[PDB]
């Protein structure tokens, strides 16, 4: 079991399998790592949770479960003929959701999140600040402190907030210049801090660095109590409006590379954003082919254009997908 | 929409009290009282006054009148060592019509604060004006932050050496004041980009300073591995922050960005939640900045600034804002015997200082006729002599010939000392440290 | 005499094309100025108007100078600067003969443009005929005299000490101090003129052997700036030695070398003592020893009265105060504004400046008298032989020396009234021997060559005249003075030089100037000497001349003309015994 | 009252001290130096103007009493050259005696013959130092002048020469014997080798005459050397302090010194150069600049001489190919006051 890899069957193993019991090979690590929490445009895990192959997927029937499996994985590990039964099942309860741990040759490790954290920390040559996943019967509703624009609709469309809910969880202030430590603490605890610059073509008398600097300040007032397992995450998205010096300043203040998320339609690029984030599996979303010249000319054409400044709600859709595995979904 | 003449005309008719009307802009929304003369003064007037009260032209006189605080004309005071100026509207509207040209006729015209007479018609000088002005710059602001935590003194048997992040030290005043005060340092790393500044810091201080080059290249990881730190001081550049420049680059483009870099390092230096060390942090900046920049700085640093003027302890009118939580930053200045206070006392041999407490050190290429006399404060053996560098490095409290390094020209060390902290002010601010800290 | 049918009479100036030489300019003279015997046919006694020694050229290697630019060489002009100074002097004298009229390196390169352009024109105003002599200059020695005497030295026919290694003359009178061999009287005068002639670059101008700078070889190792001419190394050492020396990069000069012999040419083991005896005890007029005064009792030591001509930065008063000698009055004469303001400000104003020395008369000296210590130093800018524009002692700043002489008599007591009196005069060592003889004859005293290298960190070796007690005694190294440059550096800097002679940045000079003008490594990279560096090296107090603005160039050109503090302390030590002390 | 002085002294019987003798003015300021009596301010001014003045013939320009060169009388004995006036003799000696003295040929002046009384005339006892006192306390600028020696106490003059020969000039003035030994006059063609000891061991010198060579083919040595060497040699030849013997010098230049060197000479010798012009037919043929110590050197000084014309003359002489000839006439006349100081040789006989 331990001496034989379960991802691909190789006899050369290096450590215990992260999710379940069994072995794993070095290419199996790297392939899992490249899609450790990558999510597609459908809102679910892009690849398998074990073999990390997107060719075959098994959507879990549990409304609180998203992680899928593969036909080959279930046929080879659980046993032949189980794939058809799983596919034909109207309400399939996967393997990790239900408390049973023995199913054929597949053994479920109790408290998988601990060793997942351990392996993520022991592997990450380029790590990122991140908190342990909360179990299904211990998650809490999200608290968000929005900046400078309406942000509630994206969260409600993502299930993090409900229509008609009280404004005690989301606070939207365009004039946070007057904020005080007392004001921040009387708003209460916050788990996600979200901010962005207005879309290109919007009048802005104040310098753009405004929306950066105060954001950082609020982030520093929103840091959790030291030593708490509190899952606090933040990110900052810019619509290519800051200059290169400002980009360097933001990258240094956030201690994060500017991972961009371009949107290409029909082979042509019409809009792009730059993201500074600590969310896991966001470096895999980085695009290295984009260069400064075409994004700059597109931006200048955007100021030169008459079209109204429309905020790209679709590009930030993939940012909050992994947070489903952390917090409540309604 | 504003008729100051109608307000003053009905006030002189014993109808409206002067204290119930603002003088700077004539607004009827009176909240406080003007610190210089009797009469009310509105909140927008306060905002404009904080931007102009101590804004001095490189020439050496107040650029704008102290009452109106901004105008396309201004009258220089004929009395030396008194920079304060008034506008023609204020003279002909408060004191009385036909008084400005009469003042111009009198060549040694004394400003309404310098003159012995305290009554000038509707305009009368408050007797206790220095105290009210000090309250104006220190005892009222737009922030209501709680007082910073105070660290109880530690026993002398367990007083460790001090670790200092001296960002933007320039001429490296911080460690010089630390050594003179008697306190020792374990490590003293500073960020600086000027070659002359780092040369002076390395030479005159026997290499105790460890430089990190440009401050934009140091991250939180370096602070984490190079700590723990106790004292963090900062002297952020004021070229783009002071309202003296026409450009007004502000706090959000130019060298003002450097400020926030400081803040970042500060959040990487203060203890997270241990509170096991008496962490101290000091920030210095000019007095003549915009109110927007003032409140942004105050709210980011989470501390109410205190005004310290080098006038009360040295011979330069270098009034500055200090943010931080050193014990008794608002304590009144102490005139120590050791440090000079008067220009004449700290003057060279065979010279007479025709001024007192000079604040003009830039030669301005002899300036013009109006620039003459002011930029020229030394009269040696019946001929004018421009300020020597030894003289101004004496007045700032620095040791004699402190900055004779790297064979700099007169102008290079001119600009080097023109942005330097005053030594006695730093001595006053760091005096409480020796109580909490080890003494060599 | 001197008729050969090939022209080139006495007084004509043309180039020469001697062996291993590339058209060096010079003139033609007779025998009774070079000190040698009668010539012969084809034996043209050549008087190089430049910096060369005295030798002979034949008409075959002689070509008329009327075709100036036809045979002119650019490489020596633009890469070998004493050629430029020779061009200066020869063009000047040619223009003076023709009647036409039109920091040192900067001055010569600025001035040479109009005359070089006029040479390019073709000497139009006067013509080729206009180079005539001014109606006044109009045994046996062969061409290879040196190549023949050396040809017999290694055969042991003639003693090496019996032949001069500088000019090959048989009239050996004294022994060559630095190297073993004979030395003629003309060689004596040339050596006394140009032995300590250090250029602002930081290298000896001429050769160590013959004191003639034509094509010298740089001493590769630092702290050794001495040079060697190609002829001297080719003859005394042997053929092919110059090529081998120039082939290797860090070549060591022979007297700087580790072994005491280099063939026919070997170093004297006692060279320093012999050199010191030379520079102070071969001057060609003998005077009686200076009158010494009895030591006054300790209970009757009056305060000293000092008259300091050409005071500069008031080094005399500084040394007197550092010696703890009370000064009743210190009347100093100075014109430079920076010098006078530094002297007035750094001290407590005891210096009653008079101002211009050319205006003070005997009435002022009598009114301010009596004076019992007169010190001073004449301006060496126009008196040093290192100056290409050397004008002379009798014209220009050198004339001011005679003014000093005047005032000296104005303070010297009469034959009666035997009371203490002491005087001191400082001057450059690298100056003409005739000027030195005249200066020492006017003052009625013989000089002593005091080298600052004994006590100070620099090489400011100067002639000191006067009757102060104990000049002849050797210099004493005190505990509290700095000998090497390393002790004078600020912290965090490494000294490239054991000792320094360069204070002028020379606008980065050239690549050869690099590693010579930048004697300090500060940030693992070269740096220029700081303003306080010359203060510390010269023995001056720290930050002594930080008065007024005084940018780097001004402070450098002011500290370069000042005396050496420990040297003045040594010379003034007996005055503590002979005058009031407290 | 020029002719009323006799009436004043014989009738009113008043001391002649209170009345001027030179002109007869009642107002007086000091006593007359040469003879006992009074003198007025203009009289003493013109006395100092022509105290030791001499003419081309070698005698006094003006009278020794009234300072008038109209009725000068010669002296029979050559070593005395005093000249008197007809008016003075007719007023104080006695009327009618002037013609008697003039008619008969040989004559001994009152200053020469030891008679202290002759009519109203009276000779002061030890007056020779009284002349020194008069020059000291009755001059606005009494620079330097030595007490003269009597005819019987005159040693032969010992003269040094520098760069030029003065012996011809002295023999033309009869100061030295023709064909005599060179002990009393040694000439130094080249002086750069001399030392104080050797200057002393020629012997004491009462005169140091150094002249720059004339304009033309000047030696390669700079002209300033020609004056600095003379100053140094004069300093060597100065008499030993304590016995101030008559010591004089005269440095003369033939217009080969620039303005700065004139200033340097003025500082060195403390003497403003007295320009000596020579004009024939209204044309300035030549001129010399004299720094001298001998008395009566500023009397001949000419104000109309200007610097630009002298520079033009120097340029003209340099352009011309005239031979190097010294201006003998210009300097020959100036040594006349030394006749009173040094013994006279008659070479005509
Ligand atoms: N980008 C940058 N990084 C680091 N230092 C900088 C900088 N830009 C400017 N500085 C330096 O910051 C200083 C601001 S002036 C304050 C100097 C200091 N208070 C003193 O006592 O001298 C100057 O030394 C300036 O050269
Ligand atoms: N005409 C003049 N009168 C007086 N001083 C002069 C002068 N010309 C030049 N000098 C001064 O004479 C000095 C020559 S160098 C003298 C060295 C001096 N003892 C020292 O230690 O500095 C210089 O200071 C120069 O400025
Ligand atoms: Zn595998
Ligand atoms: Zn499930
Ligand atoms: Zn699978
Ligand atoms: Zn108002
Ligand atoms: Zn106003
Ligand atoms: Zn005033
Ligand atoms: Zn020789
Ligand atoms: Zn040689
Ligand atoms: Zn060597
Ligand atoms: Zn009269
Ligand atoms: Zn007469
Ligand atoms: Zn007679």
Q: How far is residue C500's CA from residue C463's CA, in Å, rounded to a whole number?
A: 20
Token pair recorded at residue D26: 């009642």
CA C545, C550, C556, C560 torsion: positive or negative? Answer: negative
Within 10 angstroms of residue B196's Cβ, the number of other Cβ atoms is 18
Question: Cα–chain-centroid distance for residue C150?
Answer: 30
Asked whether B214 lines ligand 1 (CB < 6 A), one says yes
Domain B156-338+418-436 has CATH 3.40.50.450: no
Query: Phi, psi at residue D53, to the nearest 5°?
Result: -75, 145
Cβ of C549 within 8 Å of Cβ of B348? The answer is no
Q: Which residues of A touch B (CB under 8 A)?
A: 177, 179-181, 206-207, 209-210, 213, 216-217, 220, 225-226, 248-249, 252-253, 255
Last residue of a domain, one of D81, D113, D137: D137
Alpha carbon distances (Å) from D117 to D66, D99, D213: 19, 20, 52
Quick one: which of C91, C405, C438 has its CA closest to D221? C438
Determine contact, residues C191/C210, Cβ cutoff 8 Å.
Answer: no
- Residue B253 in contact with partner chain A when CB distance is under 8 A: yes
Q: How far is residue A236's CA from residue A254's CA, in Å, rounded to a whole number?
A: 9
CA C128, C130, C131, C135 torsion: positive or negative? Answer: positive
What is the Cβ-side half-sphere exposure of residue C555, based on CA atoms within 13 angstroms?
23
Alpha carbon distances (Å) from B84 to A187, B92, B111, B311, B339: 47, 17, 7, 15, 27
A contacts of B273 (beta carbons < 8 Å) = 225-226
Token pair recorded at residue B106: 């009198």
Token pair recorded at residue A139: 């998650």
Q: How far is residue B231's CA from residue B186's CA, in Å, rounded to a whole number?
A: 11
Within 10 angstroms of residue C45's Cβ, the number of other Cβ atoms is 22
Determine contact, residues D214/D325, Cβ cutoff 8 Å.
Answer: yes
Q: How far is residue A96's CA from residue A21's CA, in Å, rounded to a whole number?
A: 12
Determine contact, residues B51/B289, Cβ cutoff 8 Å.
Answer: yes
Token pair recorded at residue B316: 């330069």
Asked whether C310 lines ligand 2 (CB < 6 A), one says yes
Question: Cα–chain-centroid distance for residue A19?
Answer: 19
- The strand pair at B378-380 and B383-385 is best described as antiparallel
- B86 CA from centroid of ligand 8 (Å): 10
User: Nearest 5°: CA angle at D284, between D281 and D285?
Assistant: 95
Task: Tell me the residue length of chain D.
Answer: 349
Q: Which atom of ligand 1 is nearest to the CA of B174?
A: 21
* C213: Cβ contacts below 8 Å, ≥ 6 apart: C51, C52, C82, C194, C205, C206, C207, C227, C229
Residues A77 and A172 in one domain: no
Same topology between domain C13-131 and domain C298-467+559-578: no
Determine, yes or no, domain membership for D256.
Answer: yes
Determine, yes or no, domain membership for D218.
Answer: yes
CB burial of residue A194 (10 Å; 0-12, 13-18, 19+):
buried
D contacts of C395 (beta carbons < 8 Å) = 222, 224
Quick one: which of C542, C525, C524, C521 has its CA closest to C533? C542
Asked whether B240 lines ligand 1 (CB < 6 A), one says no
Q: How far is residue B363's CA from residue B372's CA, in Å, rounded to a whole number?
A: 10
- Measured between CA atoms, the residue of chain C closest to residue B405 is C530
Determine contact, residues B262/B283, Cβ cutoff 8 Å.
Answer: yes
Chains D+B touching (3+ CB pairs under 8 Å): no
Q: Hey, which residues does B188 pair with through a beta bridge? A: B164
Quick one: which of C537, C578, C440, C557 has its CA closest to C200? C557
Q: How far is residue C237's CA from residue D309's CA, in Å, rounded to a whole number?
A: 65
| CB-closest option in C403, C414, C442 to D241 | C414
Within 10 angstroms of residue D159's Cβ, the number of other Cβ atoms is 24
Token pair recorded at residue C263: 């063939």
DSSP secondary-structure letter at C234? Answer: I
Residue A234: give its domain's CATH number: 3.40.50.150
- D328 CA from centroid of ligand 14 (Å): 29
- C223 CA from centroid of ligand 2 (Å): 30
Determine, yes or no, domain membership for A296.
Answer: yes
- Please spell the DSSP secondary structure of B187-227, one letter per residue: EEEEE---HHHHHHHHHTTTT--EE-SSGGG--HHHHHHH-
Helix (H) or strand (E) holding B294: helix B291-301
The three-class DSSP label of residue C187 is: helix
Determine, yes or no, domain membership for A105.
Answer: yes
- The strand pair at B162-167 and B185-191 is best described as parallel
* D203: Cβ contacts below 8 Å, ≥ 6 apart: D158, D183
Determine contact, residues C88/C124, Cβ cutoff 8 Å.
Answer: no
Strand ordering across the sheet containing D185-188: D185-188, D159-162, D207-211, D248-253, D283-292, D274-280
Asked whether B420 lines ligand 1 (CB < 6 A), one says yes
Determine, yes or no, domain membership for A19.
Answer: no
Q: How far is residue C403's CA from residue C360's CA, in Å, rounded to a whole number?
A: 10
Within 10 angstroms of residue D219's Cβ, the number of other Cβ atoms is 13
Q: How far is residue B76's CA from residue B117's CA, in Å, rounded to a whole number?
A: 19
Q: How far is residue C343's CA from residue C349's CA, in Å, rounded to a whole number?
A: 8
Q: How far is residue A250's CA from residue A136's CA, in Å, rounded to a whole number?
A: 35
Determine contact, residues A243/A292, Cβ cutoff 8 Å.
Answer: no
Nearest Cα of chain A lies from the Cα of B377 at a distance, in angstroms, of 42
Alpha carbon distances (Å) from A247 to A209, A260, B292: 10, 12, 24
Feature table: binding site of C for S-adenosyl-L-methionine: 311-315, 334, 356-358, 561-563
| CB-closest option in A207, A226, A252 to B272 | A226
Q: How far is residue B171's CA from residue A123's CA, in Å, rounded to a whole number?
A: 46
Q: How far is residue D286's CA from residue D128's CA, in Å, rounded to a whole number?
A: 38
Cβ of D232 within 8 Å of Cβ of C409? The answer is no
Determine contact, residues A120/A33, Cβ cutoff 8 Å.
Answer: no
Domain C298-467+559-578 has CATH 3.40.1190.20: no
Residues A119 and A190 in one domain: no
Q: How far is residue C304's CA from residue B59's CA, in Å, rounded to a whole number?
A: 49
How many structural domains does chain D have? 2
- Residue C438 in contact with partner chain D when CB distance is under 8 A: yes
Asked whether C356 lines ligand 2 (CB < 6 A), one says yes
Residues A70 and A216 in one domain: no
C13-131: CATH number? 2.30.30.140
- Tell me which residue has tokens 């008087």: C47
* A21: Cβ contacts below 8 Å, ≥ 6 apart: A1, A2, A106, A107, A108, A109
Which chains sit next to A, with 3 or more Cβ pairs under 8 A? Answer: B
What is the Cβ-side half-sphere exposure of residue A53, based on CA atoms within 13 angstroms?
12
Determine, yes or no, domain membership for D349.
Answer: no
- Closest-CA residue, ligand 2 atom 26, reads C336
User: Nearest 5°: CA angle at C534, between C528 and C539?
Assistant: 155
Determine contact, residues C538/C315, Cβ cutoff 8 Å.
Answer: no
Q: How far is residue D280's CA from residue A53's CA, in Å, rounded to a whole number?
A: 131
Residues, Cβ < 5 Å to ion ligand 4: A 60, 62, 65, 94, 97
N- to C-terminal Cα separation, chain B: 66
Asked whether C425 lines ligand 2 (CB < 6 A), one says no
Q: How far is residue A33's CA from residue A1's CA, in Å, rounded to a whole number?
A: 22
Helix (H) or strand (E) holding C85: helix C81-98
CB burial of residue B147 (10 Å; 0-12, 13-18, 19+):
exposed
Residues D212 and D121 in one domain: no
Quick one: which of D222, D239, D79 has its CA closest to D160? D239
- Measured between CA atoms, the residue of chain C closest to residue B347 is C345
Quick one: which of B92, B83, B49, B93 has its CA closest to B67? B49
- Residue C106 in contact with partner chain B when CB distance is under 8 A: no
Query: Phi, psi at residue C229, to the nearest 5°?
Result: -75, 155
Residues A61 and A112 in one domain: yes
Catalytic residue list of C = 380
Determine, yes or no, domain membership for A218.
Answer: yes
Q: How far is residue A58's CA from residue A94's CA, in Å, rounded to a whole number?
A: 9
Cβ of C444 within 8 Å of Cβ of D196? The answer is yes
- D217 CA from centroid of ligand 7 (Å): 83
Within 10 angstroms of residue D56's Cβ, the number of other Cβ atoms is 10
What is the CATH architecture of C486-543?
Single Sheet (2.20)
- Measured between CA atoms, the residue of chain B closest to residue C549 is B410
Q: With b meaning 16 or more CB within 10 Å and e meaning fewer, what string describes C198-226?
A: bbbbbbbbbbbbbbbbbbbbbbbebebbb
3-state secondary structure B372-415: CCCCCCEEECCEEECCCHHHHHHHCCCCCCCCCCCCCCHHHHHH
Segment 298-357 of chain B within 8 Å of chain A by CB: 299-300, 302
Asked whether B412 lines ligand 1 (CB < 6 A), one says no
Q: How far is residue A301's CA from residue A316's CA, in Å, rounded to a whole number?
A: 22
Q: Is B287 annotated as a binding residue?
A: no
Residues D163 and D123 in one domain: no
Q: With b meaning 16 or more CB within 10 Å and e meaning fewer, what string describes C14-38?
A: bbbebeebebbbbbbbeeeebebee
Q: How far is residue D93's CA from residue A49's CA, in Å, rounded to a whole number?
A: 157
Taking each continuous run of H as one helix and of E as one strand, the counts in chain C are: 16, 18
Quick one: angle between helices C433-442 and C399-411, nearest 10? 20
The three-class DSSP label of residue A268 is: strand
Alpha carbon distances (Å) from D190 to A182, C135, C137: 106, 22, 20
Q: Is B142 annotated as a binding residue?
A: no
Asked whether C384 lines ligand 2 (CB < 6 A), one says no
Residues A85 and A220 in one domain: no
- The strand pair at A192-196 and A144-147 is best described as parallel
Token pair recorded at residue A158: 């993502």
Question: Cα–chain-centroid distance for residue D252?
Answer: 15
Q: How far is residue B97's CA from residue B117's CA, in Å, rounded to a whole number?
A: 19
3-state secondary structure B88-149: HHHHHHHHCCCCHHHHHHCCCCCCCCCCCCCEECCEEECCCHHHHHHHHHHCCCCCCCCCCC
- Closest-CA residue, ligand 1 atom 17, reads B170
The three-class DSSP label of residue A171 is: strand
Q: How far is residue C272's CA from residue A274's CA, in Å, rounded to a whole number?
A: 78
- Measured between CA atoms, the residue of chain C closest to residue B387 is C548
- Tell me which residue has tokens 């992994």: A322
Q: How far is residue C271's CA from residue C283's CA, in Å, rounded to a whole number?
A: 19
Determine contact, residues B424/B314, Cβ cutoff 8 Å.
Answer: yes
Residues D127 and D158 in one domain: no
Determine contact, residues C166/C187, Cβ cutoff 8 Å.
Answer: yes
Q: How far is residue B411's CA from residue B409's CA, in Å, rounded to a whole number?
A: 6
Within 10 angstroms of residue B332's Cβ, the number of other Cβ atoms is 9
Helix (H) or strand (E) holding B259: helix B257-267
User: Nearest 5°: CA angle at B324, between B322 and B325?
Assistant: 130
Token pair recorded at residue D245: 């013997």
Residues A291 and A148 in one domain: yes
Domain ranges of chain B: 4-126, 156-338+418-436
Residues D244 and D191 in one domain: yes
Determine, yes or no, domain membership for A156.
Answer: yes
Q: How far is residue C311's CA from residue C332's CA, in Å, rounded to a whole number?
A: 6
Nearest Cα of chain C lies from the Cα of D315 at a distance, in angstroms, of 14
Nearest Cα of chain B lies from the Cα of A124 at a distance, in angstroms, of 17
The three-class DSSP label of residue D126 is: coil
Domain that holds residue A113: 26-123
Residues A30 and A81 in one domain: yes
- The strand pair at B162-167 and B40-42 is best described as unpaired
Quick one: which of D140, D133, D146, D142 has its CA closest to D31? D133
Helix (H) or strand (E) holding D209: strand D207-211
Q: How far is residue C110's CA from residue C107's CA, in Å, rounded to a whole number?
A: 5
Residues D170 and D118 in one domain: no
Within 10 angstroms of residue C311's Cβ, the number of other Cβ atoms is 28
- D113 CA from centroid of ligand 14 (Å): 7
Alpha carbon distances (Å) from D26 to B246, D66, D125: 89, 16, 25
Asked whether C357 lines ligand 2 (CB < 6 A), one says yes
Q: How far is residue C10's CA from residue C46's CA, in Å, rounded to a whole number?
A: 9
Nearest Cα of chain B lies from the Cα of A184 at a distance, in angstroms, of 13
DSSP secondary-structure letter at A289? Answer: S
Catalytic residue list of B = 238
Nearest Cα of chain B lies from the Cα of A126 at a distance, in angstroms, of 14
Quick one: which of B26, B77, B85, B30 has its CA closest to B54? B85
* C355: Cβ contacts below 8 Å, ≥ 6 apart: C333, C334, C335, C340
């Amino acid at each position: 079991i331990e001496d034989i890899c379960i991802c691909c069957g190789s006899l050369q193993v290096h450590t215990q399998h992260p999710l379940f019991e069994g072995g794993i090979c070095a290419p199996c690590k790297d392939k899992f790592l490249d899609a450790l929490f990558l999510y597609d445009d459908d809102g679910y895990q892009s690849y398998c949770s074990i073999c990390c192959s997107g060719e075959t997927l098994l959507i879990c029937g549990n409304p609180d479960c998203t992680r899928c499996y593969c036909f080959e994985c279930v046929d080879s590990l659980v046993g032949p003929g189980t794939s058809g039964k799983v596919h034909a099942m109207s309400n399939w309860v996967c393997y990790l959701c239900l408390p049973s741990s023995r199913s054929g040759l597949l053994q479920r490790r109790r408290k998988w999140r601990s060793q997942l954290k351990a392996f993520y920390d022991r592997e990450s040559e380029n790590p990122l600040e991140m908190f342990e996943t909360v179990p299904v019967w211990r998650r809490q509703p999200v608290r968000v402190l929005s900046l400078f624009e309406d942000i509630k609709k994206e969260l409600t469309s993502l299930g993090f907030l409900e229509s008609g809910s009280d404004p005690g969880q989301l606070k939207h202030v365009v004039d946070v210049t007057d904020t005080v430590r007392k004001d921040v603490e009387e708003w209460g605890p916050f788990d996600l801090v979200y901010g962005a610059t207005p879309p290109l073509g919007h009048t802005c008398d104040r310098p753009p660095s405004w929306y950066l600097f105060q954001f950082h300040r609020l982030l520093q007032y929103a840091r959790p109590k030291p030593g708490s397992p509190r899952p606090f995450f933040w990110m900052f998205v810019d619509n290519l409006v800051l200059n290169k010096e400002d980009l360097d300043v933001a990258s240094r203040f956030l201690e994060m590379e500017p991972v961009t998320i371009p949107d290409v339609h029909g082979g042509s690029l019409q809009n792009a954003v730059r993201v500074w984030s600590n969310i896991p599996a966001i470096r895999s979303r980085h695009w290295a082919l984009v260069s400064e010249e075409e994004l700059s000319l597109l931006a200048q054409n955007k100021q030169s254009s008459k079209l109204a400044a429309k905020w790209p709600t679709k590009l930030v859709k993939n940012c909050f997908l992994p947070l489903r595995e952390y917090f409540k979904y309604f | 929409e504003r008729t100051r003449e109608r307000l003053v005309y009905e006030v002189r008719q014993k109808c409206r009290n002067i204290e119930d009307i603002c003088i700077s802009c004539g607004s009827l929304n009176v909240t406080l009282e003007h610190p210089l003369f009797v009469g009310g003064m509105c909140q927008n007037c306060k905002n404009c006054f904080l931007e102009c009260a101590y804004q001095y032209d490189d020439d050496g006189y107040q650029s704008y009148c102290t009452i109106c605080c901004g105008g396309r004309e201004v009258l220089m005071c004929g009395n030396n060592n008194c920079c304060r100026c008034f506008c023609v509207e204020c003279v002909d509207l408060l004191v009385g019509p036909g008084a400005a040209q009469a003042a111009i006729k009198e060549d040694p015209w004394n400003c309404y604060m310098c003159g012995h007479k305290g009554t000038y018609g509707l305009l009368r000088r408050r007797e206790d004006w220095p105290s009210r002005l000090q309250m104006f710059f220190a005892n009222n602001h737009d922030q209501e932050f709680d007082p910073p935590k105070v660290y109880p003194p530690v026993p002398a048997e367990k007083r460790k050496p001090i670790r200092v992040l001296s960002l933007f030290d320039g001429i490296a005043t911080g460690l010089l004041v630390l050594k003179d005060l008697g306190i020792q340092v374990d490590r003293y790393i500073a960020s600086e980009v000027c070659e002359d500044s780092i040369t002076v810091g390395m030479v005159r201080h026997q290499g105790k300073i460890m430089y990190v080059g440009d401050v934009r290249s140091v991250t939180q990881k370096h602070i984490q591995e190079w700590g723990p730190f106790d004292l963090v001081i900062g002297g952020s550049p004021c070229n783009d922050l002071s309202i003296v420049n026409p450009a007004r680059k502000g706090l959000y483009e130019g060298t003002g960005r450097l400020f926030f870099e400081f803040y970042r390092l500060l959040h990487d230096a203060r203890p997270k939640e241990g509170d096991d060390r008496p962490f101290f942090w000091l920030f210095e900046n000019v007095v003549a900045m915009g109110v927007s920049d003032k409140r942004d700085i105050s709210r980011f640093l989470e501390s109410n600034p205190v005004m310290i003027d080098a006038k009360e302890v040295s011979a330069a009118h270098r009034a500055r804002y200090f943010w931080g939580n050193l014990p008794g930053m608002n304590r009144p200045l102490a005139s120590t015997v050791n440090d000079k206070l008067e220009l004449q006392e700290c003057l060279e041999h065979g010279r007479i200082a025709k001024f007192s407490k000079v604040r003009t050190i830039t030669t301005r290429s002899n300036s013009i006729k109006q620039g003459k006399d002011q930029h020229f404060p030394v009269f040696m053996n019946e001929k004018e002599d421009i300020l020597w560098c030894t003289e101004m490095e004496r007045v700032f409290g620095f040791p004699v010939h402190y900055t004779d390094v790297s064979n700099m020209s007169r102008l290079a060390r001119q600009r080097l000392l023109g942005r330097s902290w005053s030594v006695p002010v730093i001595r006053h601010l760091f005096a409480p440290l020796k109580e909490y800290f080890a003494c060599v």
